[PDB]
Design a protein around this ligand. Structure first.
Ligand SMILES: CC(C)[C@@H](C(=O)N[C@@H](Cc1ccccc1)C[C@H](O)[C@H](Cc1ccccc1)NC(=O)[C@@H]1CN(c2ccccc2)C(=O)O1)N1CCCNC1=O
Lengths: 99, 99
C-alpha cells in the first residue's frame, strides 16, 4: 500500500492477543510500545526522545503483525504516549519513503 | 527518490543558504531544527514527546529545500536532539510511505 502523510500514519499491529494502533515511524531507530507485560527475558535500557529519556524494557525476537505483514524483532516497552513502529521492523515489512 | 530504512533517512536540506542534515520523520507532526538563527518574528511554543516537553520558537513560512524539493512552511527551532523534517513539510514534497 501507499500511505500519505496528511495525518499521522497510524496502522493496526498485533502482538499476541493484543491489537494496538501504532505509528509507522521513519525517525525511530527502534520500535517502542506502550506498557505491556510480554513474556520472556528482557533488559533495561534508556532511550532518548524529543524531551529527554525514558526507561524501557527491551524484549528480543517478538513476533508482531503489521497490516498483515509478518515481522519479528526487538520491541522496547515503556511509558510512551504513542506506539512507535521503528526502522528495525519497517524494513522487515518492505517499507520505503518515496518522493 | 526512494529511500530505504536500514539507515536513518538523513538528507541534506538548504535553509537560509545553510546546508544541514535532517531526518525525514513520518512520526513527527512538526518540523523541528536545532538551535539556529532565523529572521522574522517567532512565537513561543511548547511541544511534548517521549521524555517530556521542550520550549521552541515557531517560525512561519520558512523555505527549506529538501533533497532538491522546495517547501515553505512552519519550522520550530529549539533543543531537539536532531534536525527533524516532519509531516507538515513531507506532504509538501510529495513524500509517502510504501510497502
Ligand atoms: C519530533 C516531534 C515533533 C514529535 C515526536 O516526538 N514524535 C515521536 C512520536 C511521538 C511521541 C510522543 C508524542 C507524540 C509523538 C516520534 C519521532 O519519530 C521521534 C524523533 C526523534 C528521534 C531522535 C530524538 C528525538 C526525536 N522518535 C522518538 O522519539 C523515538 C526515540 N527512539 C529511540 C531513540 C534511541 C534509542 C532507541 C529508541 C525511537 O526509536 O523513536 N512530536 C512531539 C510533539 C507532538 N507531535 C509530534 O509529532
Amino acid at each position: 500500500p501507499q500511505i500519505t502523510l496528511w495525518k499521522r500514519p497510524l496502522v493496526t499491529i498485533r502482538i499476541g492477543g493484543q491489537l494496538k494502533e501504532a505509528l509507522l515511524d521513519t525517525g525511530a531507530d527502534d520500535t517502542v510500545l506502550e506498557e505491556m507485560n510480554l513474556p520472556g527475558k528482557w533488559k533495561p535500557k534508556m532511550i532518548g526522545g524529543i524531551g529527554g529519556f525514558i526507561k524501557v524494557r527491551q524484549y528480543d525476537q517478538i513476533p508482531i503483525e503489521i497490516c498483515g505483514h509478518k515481522a519479528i524483532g526487538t520491541v522496547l516497552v515503556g511509558p510512551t504516549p504513542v506506539n512507535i513502529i521503528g526502522r528495525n521492523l519497517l524494513t522487515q515489512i518492505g517499507c520505503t519513503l518515496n518522493f
